[PDB]
Amino acid sequence: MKINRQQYAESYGPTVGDQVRLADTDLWIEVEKDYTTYGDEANFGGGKVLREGMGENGTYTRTENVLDLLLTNALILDYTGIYKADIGVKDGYIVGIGKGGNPDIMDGVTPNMIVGTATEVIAAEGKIVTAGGIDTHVHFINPDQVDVALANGITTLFGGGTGPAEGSKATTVTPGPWNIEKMLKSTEGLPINVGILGKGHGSSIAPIMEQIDAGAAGLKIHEDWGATPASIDRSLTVADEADVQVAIHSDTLNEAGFLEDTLRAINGRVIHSFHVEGAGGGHAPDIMAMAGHPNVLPSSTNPTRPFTVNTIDEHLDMLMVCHHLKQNIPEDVAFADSRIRPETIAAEDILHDLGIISMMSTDALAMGRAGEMVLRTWQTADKMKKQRGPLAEEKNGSDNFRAKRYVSKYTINPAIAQGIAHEVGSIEEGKFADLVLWEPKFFGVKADRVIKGGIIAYAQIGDPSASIPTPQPVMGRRMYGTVGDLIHDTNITFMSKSSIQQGVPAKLGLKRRIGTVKNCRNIGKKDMKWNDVTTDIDINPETYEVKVDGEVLTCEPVKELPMAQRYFLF
Amino acid sequence: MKINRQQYAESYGPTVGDQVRLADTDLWIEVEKDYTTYGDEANFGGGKVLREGMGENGTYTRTENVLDLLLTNALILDYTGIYKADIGVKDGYIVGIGKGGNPDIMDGVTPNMIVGTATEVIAAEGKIVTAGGIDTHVHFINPDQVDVALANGITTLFGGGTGPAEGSKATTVTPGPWNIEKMLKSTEGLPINVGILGKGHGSSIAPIMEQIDAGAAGLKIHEDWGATPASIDRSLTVADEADVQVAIHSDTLNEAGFLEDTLRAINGRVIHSFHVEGAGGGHAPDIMAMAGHPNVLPSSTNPTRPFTVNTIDEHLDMLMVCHHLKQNIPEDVAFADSRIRPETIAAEDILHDLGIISMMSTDALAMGRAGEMVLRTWQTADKMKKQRGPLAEEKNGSDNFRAKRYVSKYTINPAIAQGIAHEVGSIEEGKFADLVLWEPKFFGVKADRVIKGGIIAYAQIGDPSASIPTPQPVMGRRMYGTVGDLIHDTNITFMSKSSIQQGVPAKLGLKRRIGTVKNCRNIGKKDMKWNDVTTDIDINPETYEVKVDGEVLTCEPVKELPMAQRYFLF
Amino acid sequence: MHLNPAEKEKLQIFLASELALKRKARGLKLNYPEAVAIITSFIMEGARDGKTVAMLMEEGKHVLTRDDVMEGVPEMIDDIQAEATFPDGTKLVTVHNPIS
Amino acid sequence: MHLNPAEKEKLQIFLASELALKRKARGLKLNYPEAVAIITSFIMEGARDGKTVAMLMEEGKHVLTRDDVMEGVPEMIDDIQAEATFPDGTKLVTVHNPIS
Amino acid sequence: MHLNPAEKEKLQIFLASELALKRKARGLKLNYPEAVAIITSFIMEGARDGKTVAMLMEEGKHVLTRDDVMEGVPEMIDDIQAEATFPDGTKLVTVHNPIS
Amino acid sequence: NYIVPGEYRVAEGEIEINAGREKTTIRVSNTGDRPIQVGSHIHFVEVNKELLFDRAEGIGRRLNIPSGTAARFEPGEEMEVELTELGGNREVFGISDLTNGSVDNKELILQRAKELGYKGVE
Ligand SMILES: [Ag+]
Ligand SMILES: [Ag+]
Ligand SMILES: [Ag+]
Ligand SMILES: [Ag+]
Ligand code: NI
Ligand code: NI
Ligand code: NI
Ligand code: NI
Ligand SMILES: [O]
Ligand SMILES: [O]
Fold first, then answer.
1. Does any CB of chain B come closer than 8 Å to the CB of residue F70?
2. Cβ-proximal residues to C16 (8 Å cutoff; 6+ apart), any chain
3. How far is B433 from B454, CA to CA, in rounded Å?
4. B406 and B431 both lie in a single domain
5. Quick one: which of A102, A262, A453, F57 could link to A57 by a disulfide (CB 3.0–4.6 Å)?
């Protein structure tokens, strides 16, 4: 018996060689392999295969290799590959990627992926499944930002803030032991993973270090607090001892140094360069040269992503509003023109495509959009396909190489940079079961279901009063993962080793899973999956032209993007 | 001094012999007796009777027979009677049904119903008061379902689910120890009583039983997991040892047996037959014959309730959507026509009226409406009055006999079946103070106030910014019973004896009241209040005609229902 | 009014439909959510008018045509489901492939 | 805009009133919540116009008549209450027995 | 529809704008929130129409004039900001001193 | 190049199910007055008693149909179906309690089938 490949893909999702369009982009992903045994595919429902004595084992207790949860027939899109597999979850972690069911009667069953009495089923046939997004440039300004992030497939927020205080509205900073303690206790109520950054500013060690001991997962150096050689040097000294990451927003004004003075203060130590293109902040005009150095893990914020006809007009005005610039103070006008630059924003698209910028991030509510890191990553890949063509590395007419390079920017690479990739950032065995299901038609635009530690936290679903859940209105809603005490077991507060050793979770009564920040100081650019390129980036101080290998990087702004007016009510 | 009976009923609510119309139905309830002493009626307000030295006692401490709460002048509608009484509450339980006030000066005061310094007053004069609804067919798919239930007078949800996972979207199942633990901790946040069902599937005892030990209150056998002779037999073996109830959705497809093969596997043990008519699921076409057996506690789900002109067209399409049926696969068409049957849906109205189906339930978000169990119960009683006339048992031109038979279907009978009627399911002394006040004009449509453990949890009330609470907009809102830690003291997590003995509440940090499931294995059809009829139900395999006492049960679908377009904005 | 949760939510659909109809009246090709809102509100207003489920299953396929909506939108909408109070109580209407 | 909780909620009444007025314009007898929404929005729009409490107590009894609404609806509505910002601040209007 | 949080919130602006436009049509001078709603909805409907950020920065200064609004309202509104989906994705429009 | 958001471009060719397993055709009759639909992965010998077929030929086997589909038998219907071999450990537990072990114990399965009145034990 044979099934033609159209009926096969309609029943079980696609298989080896089948391609899938990402939303309404020109980007195609190809199934690279499939863990199934054709005919023994797992599926759940009336008269289906996962039933007692059949594809569901009726013998084994939960401990005897039985799953808490099986996602059937997932099309996985991850830095590790684009492929078809069942995903098994147990104790809130991914324990098996392979072939689920019952070894009683089925060939090819991964030994620890038994569907048993204890197994819940999520049908992923026809869905794309990715890791949860890791947003490492978050301002905690407004709690309503969390659902915005969940709705576009973000599962981890790293940054800082105490709410809509000016310090927090400008900088990813929860300053000092008390604010860090208050925001750790706030975090108990936020249905997403969180890590908090302290203020990376001081000329003595103790005022900085006491933030790491209080529970900070990292530091932020921001020009608004003084991105001086001293604040840079002390923060990195603290980070090398504490094994946490430092994010930098450099001295845009060149007040105490040019870019080379900042790099000298860094002195070859590991650092996360935020909004490396520089519209979001940094050494005017040449900050983006950071992205060529091997000790720099470079990230973009999302409003420059990608370069469009409205980008420059929007940004000149955004900066005027954000900075209270006056169009009748020539210094304010010179400043804006020195900072919002089509030459660098245009080059930023191509650096992303070449794997020279490793990461995306939002800059949520400070200078960036909480729900558009995933959205604008795929808009950039699609624009670069249109302008630059398939990358040389591609084969079979698929965009798998570009898709792995771009999915890495908001999954694995921010996890590696932050020191949290042992827990999150990819669909691999042994990592926390933070999983996003997407309908291909909505891929990168609106997540179907967001799974946090093996329970659904967020879903597009309809009328709660209805016979079935699909009637209108279908909207994003918090699910049982977010209710009562289950919000503690489904989410991770990431903390420094020292705060963990010093008992800060028990001191503060934190009930959330505690994640350990580690292995941040021993990495560089080369550890950025698919995005590992070091090069001499030249930025002309007169023209702002960007050169790599003595070649000018430029492209056109586009009039139209996919994943926009087809999808959005506003 | 005498008051005419129109002014009396306007001031104090109705008294012996007075009748009240239920909403806009043709159904009339008659006050059977009144516990008051005419002239010593309790009431609260400016210059009223419950004042210090008068109807409120000024001497007694709370412990000395003083109430936490008095509902004055309630018209109670319960399986125990339709009558007028004050209802006294203390420590979250109903301690007295009788006559409240101050024995200093009043005749007829029930000794433990003293209004004292510690007493709150709820004015129930002119209201109907019922027990909270017990919905024993709940899918936990979307937390927004809870307010939907509260708004139509449901106070207890029994069923299963982990949120919008396919296993949970089809079956009332929280599978295995981990999912049951995660949903017990979720339940901490749900302002309604809850009991969780495990997966009633396996061919060994241990994989099933470990669900009861983890905290499940019962099991669900569902054809989607394999409603095989083995899964039925093992689940009932587990339930007889653990003293919990089993719900069944039988093998619609007759794959491993016909109805007689399922009854043989049950082997005379007690079982809850879900959606016994069979549109919701079961042995095609004759599942409804379950409702004649003395070991079967039979329930309807609500979308077949009652039989209307749109019912069949709605259901053929609901089933096609729900099952992904294709109108170009004849097997899909034969299946649908074998399952959606006017003959059984029509008979289902009359079985309800004859007391042969004992219970209503929703099937919330799987194949049924979370907020319409109470609504559709009264729509059925009203339709049957119109088509069948007053039941013989009636007297005085009232529908009291039918009203007791129908209120029993969503109050006491599901409580008895689940093993929780010691705590909930009726307005009787010693039970938890889960009480629903209704304006007669809204009776069965929209609850006025829902009381959970003696504190209001849900209320139709207006503008929070207003001088008084009655200005628009009046809508359903969560009240102080649902806020902070009071959500723990006002609600019950129902659990198996073994999980209670094994310390699962302390293991998981549950702060909710713990209710014990018990006395489920020693009951049958005869324990169903007002709905205790056993008979030989014949379902013709060719015509689907239903016979009881060799008489064809048929009725017409109606074009119009009460409790519909007069009330609902959509 | 005594608004229940569903009455509160479904008000939103009517509003989205009004917004979408305004956008069509100034000559825009409608997008995915606009189109879904229009057909959804149509069904619920039909139930309020006392039409049958069978009528709205037919009518729903003719509210919008591919020339009313952007490229790909007909193919993104497999069906549109809504529950509304008919004269005989709440019923579910599904319109299959509403736009060709 | 600086919307406070009540401004957010009362927007809903205006919307329900618009929905109800549309339903009356296509010749439907209005139901309980429709009727309450219409008269409520009338009062709040009256306060915005600068009418007095006494005017709206009078006018409110003539917005809808029993022939505008279904059987029993006049008798289900004992009164309709609303608070709105008059030129002299927030005041409460109660319309007693608005529909005979 | 797949409404995200922002789609849900921004529906409210359109509704407030409809309410405000009705109030202007019966000859009322508009207040602070009415004026902000009108200009805000104008921007978001402009983005849906495919206008550029630069166009809406110009047009936004001519939607309302001081004779449309009460005393002091022009001076209470320093600017009006809104984000909407343009054909090239979400962008921020700020209209500076929209009413003189 | 009309864009259907999320569309498949499936490769050329067909997917063979249950590749390399022995296939067997048997005649099966619904002797009952109610319909019987049988899924892809139920041990064929353990189906509804009132299905008449050579019960021995169901042992160690299931329907050779795509995963999660079914064969339908209307009241009185006789038709042919194709079976394929069970895989894995070739063990079956529960369902109708006819096997509870290796599918190799044909005598014991048929003895249990005959005693409980599974039609067609030869
Ligand atoms: Ag700024
Ligand atoms: Ag800024
Ligand atoms: Ag179904
Ligand atoms: Ag169903
Ligand atoms: Ni910055
Ligand atoms: Ni920032
Ligand atoms: Ni069922
Ligand atoms: Ni169900
Ligand atoms: O930033
Ligand atoms: O069900």
1. yes
2. A473, A569, C33, C34, C37, C41, E1, E3, E11
3. 5
4. no
5. A102
- The number of helices, as runs of H, and strands, as runs of E, in chain B is 16, 23
Alpha carbons F98 and F105: distance in angstroms, whole number: 10
Tell me which CATH homologous superfamily contains domain F1-122.
Urease, beta subunit (2.10.150.10)
Q: Which pair of tokens denotes residue B498?
A: 């073994």
Nearest Cα residue to atom 1 of ligand 9: A280
Q: Phi and psi at residue D4, in whole multiples of 5°?
A: -90, 170
Residues A437 and A416 both lie in one domain:
no
Dist. CA B358–CA B416, nearest whole Å:
11
Tally of structural domains, chain C:
1
Same domain, A91 and A163: no
Residues B241 and B106 in one domain: no
Does a cis peptide bond (omega within 30 degrees of 0) precede residue B473?
Answer: yes
What resolution, expressed in A, was reported for this entry?
A: 2.0
Contacts of residue B564 in chain D, CB cutoff 8 Å? none
F23-30 sheet: strands from edge to edge: F51-52, F23-30, F78-85, F61-63
Query: What range does the domain containing A46 cover?
Result: 1-131+426-483
Residue B303 Cβ contacting ligand 10 at under 6 Å: no
The structure was resolved experimentally with: X-ray
Separation of alpha carbons A399 and A379, rounded Å: 14
Residues B404 and B450 in one domain: no
Tell me how far apart the alpha carbons of residues A526 and A535 are, in angstroms, rounded to a whole number. Answer: 12
**B433 and B333 in a common domain:** no
The residue from B483, B509, B527 where one domain ends is B483
Other C-beta atoms within 10 Å of B32: how many?
Answer: 16
Whether the CB-CB separation of B512 and B485 falls below 8 Å is answered with: no
For tokens 């929703």, what's the residue? B362
Considering only CB atoms, D31 lies closest to which of B441, B463, B565, namely B565
Give residue A540 CA to ligand 9 midpoint distance, Å. Answer: 24
Count how many domains chain A has: 2
Domain housing C6: 2-100
Q: Does residue A522 share a domain with residue A473?
A: no
User: What is the per-residue DSSP string for A21-90?
Assistant: E-TTSS-EEE---B---TT-----STT-SSSBTTTB-SS--TTTTB-SEEEEEEEEEETTEEEEEEEEEE
Same domain, A320 and A468: no
Residue F5, preceding bond cis, omega within 30 degrees? no
Yes or no, beta carbons of A53 and F93 under 8 Å apart: yes
Indicate the angle between helix axes B311-323 and B330-339, nearest 10 degrees: 130
Say if CB A123 and CB A41 are below 8 A apart. Answer: no
Alpha carbon separation from A479 to A450, A455, A476, B187, F4 (Å, rounded): 9, 9, 10, 12, 30
List chain F domain ranges. Answer: 1-122
User: Could you give the angle at the alpha carbon of E92 between the alpha carbons of E90 and E98, nearest 5°?
Assistant: 140
